[model samples]
Target: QRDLSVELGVASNFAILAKAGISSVPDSAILGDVGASPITGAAILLKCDEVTGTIFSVDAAGPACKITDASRLAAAVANAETAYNQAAGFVDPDFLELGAGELRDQTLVPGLYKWTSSVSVPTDLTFEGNGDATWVFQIAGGLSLADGVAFTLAGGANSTNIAFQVGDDVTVGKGAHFEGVLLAKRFVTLQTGSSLNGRVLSQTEVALQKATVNSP
Candidate 1:
């Protein structure tokens, strides 16, 4: 069976969307829109961060240093929460709950799975599927993938169809390479030199350092 990724509505457009602070160090590359709403942070000051897309803020007033398109900003923020809820609602077949939710060097087919606790990746994990197959990972707790961890795709797996609905914070280790949209309930932090080929929608802060993010 194949199930393609559904529209996130406005959430489908942002590469990095947060309800709070969104900060990054210089050299972190982003290939799509990055923004935070009503947050007290600088929200992309264009200081040293390299962004090939526009930055958004809820208010074009005050001291927000990025681009401001009120219509897009409003829709992006609301749609993120909506997308997170939709991602969390998917459930796989009962028998699909095989693993203890510790995805380590294992290969998984296309489907949705739930983990009641935090998940850690000690090594590489692979997924095999075509563009029409979607994989949803529902983690009831935080996600902390180790350094050097990677999500390698086989066949015609589409990163855009893979989503992560995290119940807590997300810490992508340094030098990690990940592929999937992340809808985090808390902060989403990408360590130094990391890279992501999907989206990140955080309910709180999002901090990245010397990372590369390309949204599909």
Candidate 2:
């Protein structure tokens, strides 16, 4: 009888997925000893989004890490697909209908907005705070900070907070100043000069474009 009572560390390995190219372990994840070693010579695994590239993980760690094969990689992709399909009902582009109980035109305040159905933002949308600097926007859906969209702080926002709990993906356009956590069940993108400060839980990828994320 083998009594196997062991404790294994969490898998904190990350890799990049390039276009028209095969999956390769990133030097940062390999050369560095931040986490565990990666499996080697296995099929490519990937998770991608608009803002970030593909992301994959290794099953085990060591000089000869055992990565998932192509079939297993495909399974991961399928899992993502399934999750997205399920979240479809909670992600849409209709702000008026989506923010029915929370948003009030230019009178929108800071708070969490739970969506019973999908929410969408066809055109670029802006969230402005009041003159008193008392506004916070917490969205619970796939929040698309489309290109050219700006989150303006009308008054002196000392501790203004804006959180986006995207069920799918969060896309931040170039030259946008986003302040808060852009949490995504799939992926999160940060364009150049775009600032973000919060935790990101992405099932796919998290891209950074010369952005700064700090805590308050």
Candidate 3:
């Protein structure tokens, strides 16, 4: 059976959404709306020119372009939490503990996947599927991608159709290329020179270091 895409609701509007704070290194490029909620706007450190879209904040301490909208921020946070829960709600995964939590030089098709422990991508990885196919990875722990690892999509795969639900923190290695919308229960960190082709909705914080992120 095919897996359906996880509904993000209002959370889908943000490319980078965090609960606690968002920290950035020198320069990071983000192509979609960014937001932080239930925390002081001082916690969001991205400069005004760094984001190509709106920056939503609960207070006035964020970037110069920050839009202080408490109600909207609250709603987005709630929606993000709901999406995280929905991703975890899926059962009977098509792949369980594949690669023993370590993925390297692998080509995967679209489906629901579950892992009992942390997952690591130490080498190149690819997703081979058509545009309509969806992939959901339910990880009970954290995620780590090695430096300089290339994450490719083939056969007309779309990054927006893939979801990576992590129970702990997520780290994208330096110079690594990543895809898929990431929903982390803890934090999401992008190392220097890394890039993401999907959204980052974290329950806690998101840290970017000279990274490039685009909303799909």
Candidate 4:
């Protein structure tokens, strides 16, 4: 069997990236680069605007961020688009169609899973990949994580090989925890107190509130 892992070239510069714009509340910590392209809306960083990485925008009008680099922002945006498209085109041999769309309290193994419709998580979900395996999720519609739910990984699992290809939008509920690469076709919203341990790339806007996102 063949194992796969996505390498996000220039886009790797960002841990949280958006095309339209990014809005976040204070006390949110992002460990990697964050940026937006075709930049128009300023990143309205609320109180406690703490970030461990540089923040860049396509335009020079980058909101009072830690760092501003417009020279490489365009290429980064293009690379993110490429990675998103590549993930969408990936074929899964053991394609799973969870038409019902509810993935609550499920412990899943390493494989490719597909949902014909929208998906929601009302409770906790677990994933194990044995370090060398990869898991890909393709949701035709929006994906939602209910409040208080978390994504757990055990058995030597790593977050770098896990990918989410969301067709429409994504909503990470309050206090929810996630670990994976999120590539959304539309906007992505992380409610208050949400936390993620991977990368987030949205074609549209990305909003975060009092959250913590760390790149793997």
Candidate 5:
């Protein structure tokens, strides 16, 4: 299969990153760095203590613990865009339009999965791979996980090795369990009680509500 997984570069430094803004409800837990670029610090609404890692901002008006680093934020956002573009441009996908873009209860192995439209996962999904394997998804439209769905990795698959390049929005359903590095062209919303084990990088905004996020 063609290699669609591109190195994220400085983008890998962030668990949550947005170009427009970040809005989070109280008590959202993020285990890695967060950043917002080209937007005022006021646009990043995550609480200081809720993010265990450094918060990058363009100005000083963000969370109390934010580090005003416009240059770093700019580089990170640029790199994220580069990675997203690279992944989106890959050809000869191993799987195309699987399940007609509606996936459920499937065990997918390492490969390039592409869709011309949106993808909705209404049930449990599993990925099987070894430590060196990579799963790259190029979604032309939005990506959504149903509520309470469990996204699991088997055979020693690592979350960090999986990448989802979404052209539109990404929604993590309430109470859902998800994993992967989500590189979104639009918004990313982590609904209440949802959990993610990888990064959420968006060219737009990110909305979080009492979600648990850990960067791999």
Candidate 6:
């Protein structure tokens, strides 16, 4: 077992919208050995506390590689904007036109949400914590770990996918710790001293602010 200690110094609220895309594992021995890589045909986006990155797009001949797109990229930006506006308590009438889909609330009972349709957050979504302690958002879609946020997971067995589709983004706050796979259709961002254990996929680029991933 691993003993990790986190200091939740202050309480702040932020919002984000996330989407999910398909994930692919490489077939080559060398590449597959390192775990699954985002398929080239897939796109990703991210928007966090103070950073942003994207996967652009993907190109797969025999093997797969990521590619980049502009229009879909703009849609990812719009997703982030909607999340930001909702978090700020402003409901944009045009928000729904931006492809903001259904909102689903889950009680996550220590299990995995596998093969579920990609999630779309049209408004600011908040993860309710059981206590003052930290909670984990095991995501399998294009997620936005908005800035100034902190989360904790029980362990690997229950890790979920923070997945996102094309034109998706994740925002994180300062001093936040996150785990699981962060797939993006557009980009992703991490704040200083914030931690995560997952692969980040973007359609355009990826930005980091004092974040670290586990080393093999």
Quantify all predictions' global Cα lDDT against the true fold: 0.79, 0.37, 0.91, 0.80, 0.90, 0.33
**What is the per-residue lDDT of model 6 for residues 121-174, given as tens digits with 9 covering 90 to 100?**
333333332322222222334454444444443333322223222234555555
Best by lDDT: 3
Tell how far residue 31 is off in model 5, in angstroms.
0.5
* Tens-digit lDDT string for candidate 2 (9-106): 12111122211122222211111111111223223322122213223333432123333344444443343334333333332222434455222233
**TM-score against truth, every candidate:** 0.91, 0.43, 0.97, 0.92, 0.97, 0.36
Rank by lDDT (best first): 3, 5, 4, 1, 2, 6
In angstroms, how far off is 174's CA in candidate 3? 0.4
Where is the poorest 10-residue window by lDDT in model 2?
A: 28-37
Q: Which residue runs of candidate 4 sit more than 4 Å off their true CA positions?
A: 41-48, 64-66
Which sections of candidate 1 miss by over 4 Å?
2-4, 45-49, 61-65, 92-98
Task: Please give the distance, in angstroms, between residue 67's alpha carbon in candidate 5 and its true position after superposition.
Answer: 0.7
Worst 10 residues of 5 by lDDT: 1-10
- Model 5 TM-score is 0.97
Candidate 4's residue-wise lDDT over 1-216, tens digit each? 346566677877688788788878777888888887776536534332566877776665655654456667778778878877777777864566653789867888887788888999988999865888888888889999999899999888888888888999899999999989998889898899999999998888888888889996
Give every collision pair in model 5. Answer: none
Clashes of 6: 67
Q: What local lDDT does model 6 show for residue 189?
A: 62
Worst 10 residues of 3 by lDDT: 1-10
Residues 84-157, candidate 3, lDDT per residue (tens digit)? Answer: 88889987899999999999789998889899999999999999999999999999999999999978999999
| Candidate 6 segments exceeding 4 Å error | 1-107, 110-142, 146-148, 160-166
Q: How much is 70 displaced in model 6, in angstroms?
A: 24
Better of 2 and 3 by TM-score: 3
